[PDB]
Amino acid sequence: KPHVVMIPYPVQGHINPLFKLAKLLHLRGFHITFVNTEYNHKRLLDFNFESIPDGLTQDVPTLCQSVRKNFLKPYCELLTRLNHSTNVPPVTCLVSDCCMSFTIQAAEEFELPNVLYFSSSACSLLNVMHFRSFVERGIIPFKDESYLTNGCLETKVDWIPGLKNFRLKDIVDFIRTTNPNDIMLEFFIEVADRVNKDTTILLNTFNELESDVINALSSTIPSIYPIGPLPSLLKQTPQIHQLDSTECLDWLESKEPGSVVYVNFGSTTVMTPEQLLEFAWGLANCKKSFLWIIRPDLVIGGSVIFSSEFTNEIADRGLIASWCPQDKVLNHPSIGGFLTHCGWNSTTESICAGVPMLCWPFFADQPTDCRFICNEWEIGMEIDTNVKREELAKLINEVIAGDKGKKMKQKAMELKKKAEENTRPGGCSYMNLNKVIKDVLLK
Fold it and tell me: Does the annotation count 14 as an active-site position?
């Protein structure tokens, strides 16, 4: 029986997509061993969840640092045990998060096929594969902090085939450093160097969404395989719901289609109370209905921003909640827009829901996604880093009732349709996954 060991980078944003893939692989006959760090295994509490220590006393740089040296050993020990266990069949293959590059070494040692899953866009991958070049070209690290204000970030990156209108500012922002020993930069350069012509890499995207970028990547990594978007794939997967083991949706049911702006900046990052205030009043001042998922208590002095004055004002238009089943919300007919940091999971989900976006890029691949969302796909607009209510209210209204908004909804719906055609019989993303399983994962 096929037995795949799966391990994602230790953050929710990476665990979630790989878990979805895990469910797909399980439906396909694979005995699954999903490997979380103790920390993540605690939170979450032929499909077995295992855990390994992360070697820490979470901070991304610190985690990445531990991942580069403290995961190989316990990981291999786990493989050894699984191979000598009487409770489960021996391991036949590995599906590893691209950021967990130590698995490549493990795979060679245990002589096992290892398919990598990159959790971000094809463009982000292309960026990562070139971090090394930015250094060799003498571009990064920058000489000093003045690069943040001297217009250096506006510089166009035109030496990377496949990228059309990119600026240094749009590159996965880990290049933004003045430190030659920067953890993140070195982490990703190591990841990129471990990838070669024989590496099979799965991407949560589809051909049409990133055509030039994908073609460009394929010249270096011929075995890059778009198998997404995951949302559309799972949605159209027979019997997917048997692996499926409130007030918000009720609130939305009475709203006119496309009239509600959905806001959710995730928990992974807490914003400034100054920023928190501009969003609250920007939302209140636009006069549009809105569902805002946020935990004010996390923000220092945040709960105070939600005054009795604010509460009365939004009385007939907005609802603040601590959590919500994002999938069902994004796909609710009342949603007319999605305010987000535009990380990859959010972007693909919004695309699959056919919902225009409003991006507020914070870090990593967010500005990268924003650049495509704004200039390539034209299904959204960008919010200034230093958010201000007046301008925010304007952007929201443009998307919700303006002419630009209608055009973005149109382009979003177009992408939604192709996302779905790609992830069902006859579609390339769908066919690509079948091919990887058949030609690589299976003996």
Answer: yes
